[PDB]
Design a protein around this ligand. Structure first.
Ligand SMILES: N[C@@H](CCC(=O)O)C(=O)O
Ligand SMILES: N[C@@H](CCC(=O)O)C(=O)O
Lengths: 227, 227
C-alpha cells in the first residue's frame, strides 16, 4: 500500500490540520483499512525558514531538510514538505533524495494553469525574496505579486494569527480588501498556513474566493497522486 | 529535544485530531521552535482490532504492532499507541520494545485515582472482552462496566459515527442517557475515538460531564511526560 511522508512542523498547527484534511477528503466507504497511510514528521524545532535567510544560517536549515528527507525516503513512497518557503533548500539537496518529492510549487502551478485567471500570491517575505513561485511556475504571468508593504502585512498574519492557532476567519476582511485592491477573486497559498484560511472558507460556504491551495489539492487527490 | 512517537491510524480521524490537540494545548510563547516534536505513523491499514479477536488472526495484528514499535523505538524517546483495544497486543511484545511506551490504560488509571468517583467505561466490545481496564487499573472498583447490550450500542457509535468523522455532539444525548442510567457524571475514554467527544464537550463549554480521556491528558502534559 502507498505511503505519504510529510516533512512538517513548519507550521505545526497547519501540519496537524493537513493530516485532518487527508481523512476528511478521503472518507472510507465500509472500513478504515481503505483510508490513506501517512507518516508525519512534525518537527517545529526546524529553524525558522525566513529567519535562516534573514540571518546567514541557510546551511543549518538545508541540513535539517536533507537529513529528514533521507529518513522519509526509506519509509514513504511519496513525500511532501509542509512549507512553501522551505522549498528554497531543494537546489542544494541531491537529486536522488528528491525523486519522491511532490512540490507544492508545481502543484500550485498546475492548478493555476487550469484556472487561468490572474491570482494573488500570498506568502512569506522569504518566499518572496527567494522568488520560488515566479521562478518555479510556468503560469508566472498569471501571478500577481504583493507590493513590499503588503508582503510585510501578510507575514504578520502568518506569524501573529495563523501560526498561533487563532481563528483564520479573523483575517478574512483583511484578505478581501487585498483581493479587491489587487483586482482579483483568487489567491495562491504561497504560505502553507493559508491552508487554514482555505478550510475555514470551505466550512462557512464562501465560494466568492477561489483558493489555489496545494495542501487541499494533495488531500483531495491523494489516491491519484500517491503511488 | 524530546520526540513523541504515535503509532496511530487506529482511528485515522482521531489520530489526526490528537496531533491537533498537542499543539492546541501547547501554544508557543514567542517562536514555533518551542513547540512539541512528534512523529505520527497513521496507518489505517492496521487490521481491525476487535475484528482480529473476533476472527482468529491475532498474530497478524500483533506482528503489525511489533514491527512498527521497532521503527518508532529508533526514532522517538516516548511512544503512544492511538488505540486502547490495540494494547491487548502488548503481553506478546518483547519488554525491550515497550520501555518507551506510555500506556493509555495506565494514564486512565492515574486520572481515575485522583478523581476517585465511580466512572463509566465506554469502550469497544474487544476492549471489554480483553478486560484491559479491569485487569490493568489499580482503580478497577471505581470502573462501572456497561452491560453487554450497552457495549454493542457504544461499538455502533464508535464505528458508525465517530470513526466516520461525523459530529461527535450527535451522540451526546445518547451518552447523557447512559451516564444517567448508570448513575454517574463521568466516563473513561476506553475507546480513543471518545477523544473526539471530549474535545467537542470542552469546545461547547459543557463541564457537567467529567471525561477521563488519556489523549487529552497526554496532550496537556506533553512537556512533563515526554523525556
Ligand atoms: N509555512 C509557510 C511560511 C513560514 C514557514 O515556512 O514556516 C510556508 O509555506 O513556507
Ligand atoms: N479506537 C478505539 C476502538 C477501535 C480501534 O481500536 O480501532 C480504541 O481505543 O481501541
Amino acid at each position: 500500500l502507498p505511503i505519504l511522508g510529510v516533512l512538517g512542523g513548519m507550521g505545526p498547527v497547519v501540519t496537524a490540520e493537513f493530516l485532518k484534511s487527508i481523512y476528511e477528503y478521503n472518507p472510507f466507504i465500509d472500513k478504515e483499512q481503505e483510508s490513506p497511510n501517512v507518516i508525519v514528521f512534525s518537527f517545529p524545532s526546524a529553524p525558522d525558514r525566513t529567519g535562516s535567510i534573514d540571518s546567514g544560517k541557510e546551511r543549518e536549515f538545508i541540513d535539517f531538510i536533507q537529513v529528514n528527507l533521507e529518513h522519509l525516503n526509506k519509509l514513504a513512497d511519496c513525500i511532501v514538505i509542509g512549507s512553501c518557503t522551505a522549498h528554497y533548500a531543494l537546489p542544494q539537496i541531491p537529486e536522488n533524495l528528491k525523486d519522491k518529492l511532490i512540490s507544492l510549487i508545481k502543484i500550485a502551478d498546475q492548478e493555476l494553469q487550469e484556472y487561468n485567471e490572474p491570482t494573488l500570491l500570498l506568502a512569506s517575505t522569504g518566499t518572496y525574496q527567494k522568488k520560488l513561485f515566479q521562478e518555479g511556475c510556468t503560469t508566472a504571468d498569471l501571478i500577481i505579486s504583493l507590493s513590499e508593504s503588503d508582503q510585510k502585512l501578510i507575514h504578520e498574519m502568518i506569524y501573529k494569527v495563523l501560526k498561533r492557532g487563532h481563528d483564520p476567519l479573523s483575517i478574512l476582511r483583511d484578505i478581501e480588501a487585498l483581493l479587491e485592491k489587487y483586482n482579483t477573486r483568487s489567491y495562491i497559498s504561497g504560505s502553507t498556513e493559508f491552508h487554514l484560511l482555505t478550510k475555514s472558507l470551505k466550512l462557512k460556504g464562501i465560494d466568492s474566493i477561489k483558493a489555489i491551495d496545494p495542501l487541499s489539492t494533495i488531500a483531495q487527490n491523494f489516491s491519484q497522486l500517491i503511488i
